[PDB]
Design a protein. Sequence first.
Lengths: 484, 484, 131, 79
Amino acid sequence: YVPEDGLTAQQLFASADGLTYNDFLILPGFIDFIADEVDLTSALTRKITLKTPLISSPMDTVTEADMAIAMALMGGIGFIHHNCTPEFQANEVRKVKKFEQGFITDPVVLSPSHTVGDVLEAKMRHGFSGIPITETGTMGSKLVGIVTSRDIDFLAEKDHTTLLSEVMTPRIELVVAPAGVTLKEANEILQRSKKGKLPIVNDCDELVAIIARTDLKKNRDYPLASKDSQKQLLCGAAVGTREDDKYRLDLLTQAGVDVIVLDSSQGNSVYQIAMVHYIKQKYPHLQVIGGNVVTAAQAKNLIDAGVDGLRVGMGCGSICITQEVMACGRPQGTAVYKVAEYARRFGVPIIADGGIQTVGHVVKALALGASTVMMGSLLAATTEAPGEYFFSDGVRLKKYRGMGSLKIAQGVSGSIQDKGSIQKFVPYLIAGIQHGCQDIGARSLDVLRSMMYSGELKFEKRTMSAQIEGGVHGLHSYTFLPFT
Amino acid sequence: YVPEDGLTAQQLFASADGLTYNDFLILPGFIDFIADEVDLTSALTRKITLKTPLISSPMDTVTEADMAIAMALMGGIGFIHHNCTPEFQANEVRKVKKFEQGFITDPVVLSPSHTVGDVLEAKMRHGFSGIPITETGTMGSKLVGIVTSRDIDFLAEKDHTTLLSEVMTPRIELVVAPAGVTLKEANEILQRSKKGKLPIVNDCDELVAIIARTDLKKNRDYPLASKDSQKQLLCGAAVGTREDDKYRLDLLTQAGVDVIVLDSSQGNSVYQIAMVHYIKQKYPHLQVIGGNVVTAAQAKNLIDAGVDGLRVGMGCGSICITQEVMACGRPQGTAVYKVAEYARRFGVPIIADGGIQTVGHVVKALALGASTVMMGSLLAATTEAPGEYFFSDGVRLKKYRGMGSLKIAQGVSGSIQDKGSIQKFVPYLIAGIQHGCQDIGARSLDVLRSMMYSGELKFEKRTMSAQIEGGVHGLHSYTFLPFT
Amino acid sequence: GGIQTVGHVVKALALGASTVMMGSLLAATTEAPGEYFFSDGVRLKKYRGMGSLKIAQGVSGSIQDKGSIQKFVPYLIAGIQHGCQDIGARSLDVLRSMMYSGELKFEKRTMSAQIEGGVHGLHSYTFLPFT
Amino acid sequence: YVPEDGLTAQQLFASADGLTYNDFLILPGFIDFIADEVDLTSALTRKITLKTPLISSPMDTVTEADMAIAMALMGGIGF
Ligand SMILES: NC(=O)c1ccc[n+]([C@@H]2O[C@H](COP(=O)([O-])OP(=O)(O)OC[C@H]3O[C@@H](n4cnc5c(N)ncnc54)[C@H](O)[C@@H]3O)[C@@H](O)[C@H]2O)c1
Ligand SMILES: NC(=O)c1ccc[n+]([C@@H]2O[C@H](COP(=O)([O-])OP(=O)(O)OC[C@H]3O[C@@H](n4cnc5c(N)ncnc54)[C@H](O)[C@@H]3O)[C@@H](O)[C@H]2O)c1
Ligand SMILES: Nc1nc2c(ncn2[C@@H]2O[C@H](COP(=O)(O)OP(=O)(O)OP(=O)(O)O)[C@@H](O)[C@H]2O)c(=O)[nH]1
Ligand SMILES: Nc1nc2c(ncn2[C@@H]2O[C@H](COP(=O)(O)OP(=O)(O)OP(=O)(O)O)[C@@H](O)[C@H]2O)c(=O)[nH]1
Ligand SMILES: Nc1nc2c(ncn2[C@@H]2O[C@H](COP(=O)(O)OP(=O)(O)OP(=O)(O)O)[C@@H](O)[C@H]2O)c(=O)[nH]1
Ligand SMILES: Nc1nc2c(ncn2[C@@H]2O[C@H](COP(=O)(O)OP(=O)(O)OP(=O)(O)O)[C@@H](O)[C@H]2O)c(=O)[nH]1
Ligand SMILES: Nc1ncnc2c1ncn2[C@@H]1O[C@H](COP(=O)(O)OP(=O)(O)OP(=O)(O)O)[C@@H](O)[C@H]1O
Ligand SMILES: Nc1ncnc2c1ncn2[C@@H]1O[C@H](COP(=O)(O)OP(=O)(O)OP(=O)(O)O)[C@@H](O)[C@H]1O
Ligand SMILES: O=c1[nH]cnc2c1ncn2[C@@H]1O[C@H](COP(=O)(O)O)[C@@H](O)[C@H]1O
Ligand SMILES: O=c1[nH]cnc2c1ncn2[C@@H]1O[C@H](COP(=O)(O)O)[C@@H](O)[C@H]1O
Ligand SMILES: O=c1[nH]cnc2c1ncn2[C@@H]1O[C@H](COP(=O)(O)O)[C@@H](O)[C@H]1O
């Protein structure tokens, strides 16, 4: 027999003293496994599951098309901000969705009568090189040939008037697959064909769809990417709660959004509940994420309205000044614990929103019940963030401002310190998270939360001196160098 | 008639007051042309000419294979440092040379009896994907087939034992060109072939050489690259003046160095002159660059020894502490002017070495007679610089230390502030240089120096208050944001 | 007085001074009188002028520790002889002969070259003389 | 023939502008020898000669018996 040490989560938060991420620790356990065995699959909404617990917040300083793509390629997800025109946001969503497609049912096509100028224009506009050619120049017509970049490289920049009929590979020479073939078999006939495209045709011999080799190359290159049933990246977008956001929502849903995150400082309001009802009534197949909530009472009515996933955290963001504009707020540790313990019964996952500044906080938030963790400032200065770097005091920086920072300024605008590529940063966050889980002794995140709720995971309250002692405190100067 | 204003160069430097880059200006002239018309072709040695005036200094914190490639791809050149093993430096030189080749006379080949594991190993080791296959597995044998990446992608990671005979395209199907064909015609048969390779063969039907499409793609992508007669990048390397550097020089010359830069703090010495003579005696086809010199007398004996190009500047580097270890030195403006005016008669170009910190200094050094300008600190923290970034005080930095900074420390070690890609930084330097030349009114750099020597380009001496006034002085805080 | 670097040690020997007297460089070496004391996370030895105190003609300060004299002086000698070598002088007598005969030629250094003559482009740095 | 560069000492100090150690340099020359061949014997007085040019100043914060010994052991002297 060995004495019990530490306080269970319910015992630590029973005092109602207002703890946060920096005021407690997790006592370590046992290791019977290697860190890489840790499984990080985390639920985002009741019908969406991610292969990593990391999300990017919807703001005008993060989550462009580039950041959304770079996040979706590592299992996470990206929420495009709504501080922009409805058609601009829909364009960004379409751009994120059209990255890898499989069956491309709406490609770019042309006709023999077109000219090399047309293929060059299509290239310069979209980036798609391959262009199937059809009699009429649309899908509902017989296939004639395909023109790609390798057919345009050797031109002399003065024969652009040449008709595409003189550069396409004729239909008789193409390799195609009959319509109705499953993707697996289509990928097989593409690979054994050892070529770059397969324009699918039917018994009538007219183009129906097309497949590309670089798509399966990307699949082989990024095993952890997040995709829907059509083998294309998942994308999210934020929306307000005005009567004029219905048009924006319609535009987004036509663009192909998968999950919508209602965006407000406080979720508890008739205005938000009405839009949740509207979304569930007009788009029954769309996943909606509730607004900011910090309380069980603040959640109950949103869950009743029909939110598929909640977003917990208010007044806590590294840019948020709600706690000073108004007196309202709640420390993030208490908020996460006391909205997750209530939400677990109805099966609605939670998103620990704001306040994350280190892998320690990323693992703490995942320990307290948050299925996934949303993160705005850490990803603020990565290469994928929108904007262009600028040199402030002998250092290149990217601006970082809250989306409501400006009648009243609820936020602040600042600068962050450059971090390199998201595709090279996220793996380090994943490695740190799984190392922390290993040290705790958790086979996975679901087990990590099971240990907490059953009482097996025991915390200890950290005083101020231990908070200072918990960092680096005895050095004259130093450097960090995370591997990233 | 309008009065003459300003001091010619000879009038400005006649006072022997020890001016530098910050103590004078160039009065502006007339504009009858657009900036982009400025031609920046600059001589490096008596038999090497560059399409840009920028060089990277040989140091252990710059000019790796990556930086040398990134510089050679923009017209400049890169000098690989000699603070490394002879075989390591030779490997770096060979790596820089084997970037784009045209006729690849020593490719990687294999034989039917090999296995897919062999092609995968060659890929993982070198990076070359295409591998012509021959009966014996060497050049002196009949060609049988070629295996590339598109023939290996669809394998299942468990049939690696498969013989390459089951994946190569057989000789009967290949497209080849007869031996003795000129490169232009070979490139033509490659482009009209609309295919990725041409393994050259002779009347005996055995492999002699091979060409690649990505090489001419790079040629089309980088019009300003610097290459020798064999269509591969120029590379330079530094060497010491000991009796044991002969082996290093032999290894480098076998690796294919084009220009050698004798590396010493002071060039005037029997030890340096003896190695200049040795190089000219054993490698008559090699361009050698003299050591650091600051005086006409200091140059005369090196020119007599046979230096093909001089390197002017001593005690001036942003990291150099020679002026404090010893009393010797000379301000860079006076040194450049008074070693270029002497060197012009013998036709030996000059390299303004050290002290450059801005495009203003880059254009000042080119105005005073320096055919090309060598630059170590500006390129110090770019992505291509050797080493990995590290976070010091909320900012990621790359170390920058002088190659002699450590019996006695003649240098210092510090940090620099990250600058992004060389391929994205050098174009901004070129644009700034040509804008300055345009403002002066010079059609090109040769005209810019002609105006100075003839007296048409007139400077003015800048006092301390104008030095402060010449910058930014009235702002509380600010940002720069160069386009780069 | 006024010597602060091997550069000044060689400059003073170039201008005619047969030998050079030096007070501050040797101030904090282990052999200096007194005991080290920690001021701001650093152990230092006091350094004050002998007339620093009716009237104070001097000042009292602190210096930064330098290790043994027997391990410091050889580095000064090595630096001096390296500077003489770079000048091209077989010895100090020859170094002064060249100056008086006119063979040793100086150049006047302006303020910008004084800044340029040091370390000026680094964010932070370290020196580490071998000593 | 190679032009003369720089100012002799008498030419540099003729201006009576008040130069110091930080306001001038020595232009470099030629090397036909190794550094260790440099001989540093320096005269201290008319009847005393030292093997190094370094002296320690007489002050209450330097030149005790220990510093005088440590200096005399390297050719110099201690006051
Ligand atoms: N998560 C955080 O910590 C946090 C906090 C504050 C702000 N923010 C960010 O700033 C943005 C702005 O926040 P906000 O709360 O000021 O904006 P908001 O639109 O969510 O709320 C501001 C006001 O809008 C009103 N409103 C909403 N719908 C309405 C309707 N249909 N009719 C009439 N009035 C209506 C509300 O009553 C409220 O007074 C958020 O969308 C979010 O991106 C985040
Ligand atoms: N350009 C600058 O401002 C500058 C200044 C100082 C140092 N540096 C860098 O630091 C490096 C080191 O400079 P350094 O002058 O100390 O090194 P170096 O080898 O060039 O000279 C140092 C010593 O080597 C001796 N030496 C050279 N060849 C010899 C031989 N064959 N036999 C005997 N002795 C020989 C010289 O006599 C001299 O005393 C340089 O190569 C350069 O990269 C640059
Ligand atoms: N054309 C095409 N095929 C794809 C794409 N992504 C996956 N596939 C194919 O669809 C199947 C997906 O199974 P896996 O290869 O295991 O892919 P994965 O890494 O599990 O990725 P997911 O299946 O999305 O979880 C295989 O036949 C893939 O080759 C894509 O973007 N385009
Ligand atoms: N830009 C663009 N990409 C599309 C479009 N539709 C599908 N894609 C996908 O984007 C990629 C476009 O591939 P291509 O531009 O043909 O690529 P490529 O010419 O083979 O060149 P690389 O793949 O880059 O070597 C594929 O992954 C397509 O599935 C479209 O309309 N525009
Ligand atoms: N195979 C091959 N051919 C090349 C390469 N570089 C240039 N060429 C060809 O050689 C000739 C070079 O002439 P240009 O096309 O004008 O090239 P450039 O931009 O002037 O480059 P340089 O000729 O090196 O100055 C053309 O036939 C090119 O296609 C290369 O790396 N590989
Ligand atoms: N790594 C490597 N490159 C070589 C070698 N010899 C020549 N090269 C050049 O390096 C490039 C190698 O091209 P590959 O690796 O075949 O390129 P690829 O498979 O066509 O793929 P991408 O060109 O990157 O789309 C060409 O520019 C060659 O000319 C070698 O031995 N190793
Ligand atoms: N399905 C197909 N059947 C027959 N020929 C095809 C097919 N797809 C492409 N081609 C032809 O093959 C050649 C190049 O095909 P590929 O797909 O490699 O082009 P690409 O991918 O744009 O080349 P690159 O690697 O330069 O981007 C062209 O002649 C093109 O018309
Ligand atoms: N000269 C040639 N003649 C005939 N077939 C060739 C020739 N060169 C390559 N191939 C074949 O063409 C196919 C792919 O050629 P390609 O040069 O596009 O490969 P790759 O450049 O490695 O492709 P990727 O774009 O994926 O890198 C393979 O079947 C290869 O064996
Ligand atoms: O202007 C703003 N005011 C207040 N909160 C904001 C503002 N913009 C974004 N936020 C939120 O602040 C959090 C930012 O996460 P962080 O990385 O902890 O700063 C997220 O919840 C954002 O949605
Ligand atoms: O350790 C060193 N001491 C002195 N000079 C150095 C050292 N390393 C490099 N240098 C030179 O200092 C110059 C650096 O250029 P910068 O960019 O002006 O610093 C070049 O001449 C380098 O060759
Ligand atoms: O109290 C003082 N006032 C003024 N000069 C002093 C005093 N003490 C020492 N000195 C002199 O100042 C010089 C010190 O050399 P330093 O190393 O250049 O400071 C020597 O000439 C000392 O003799």
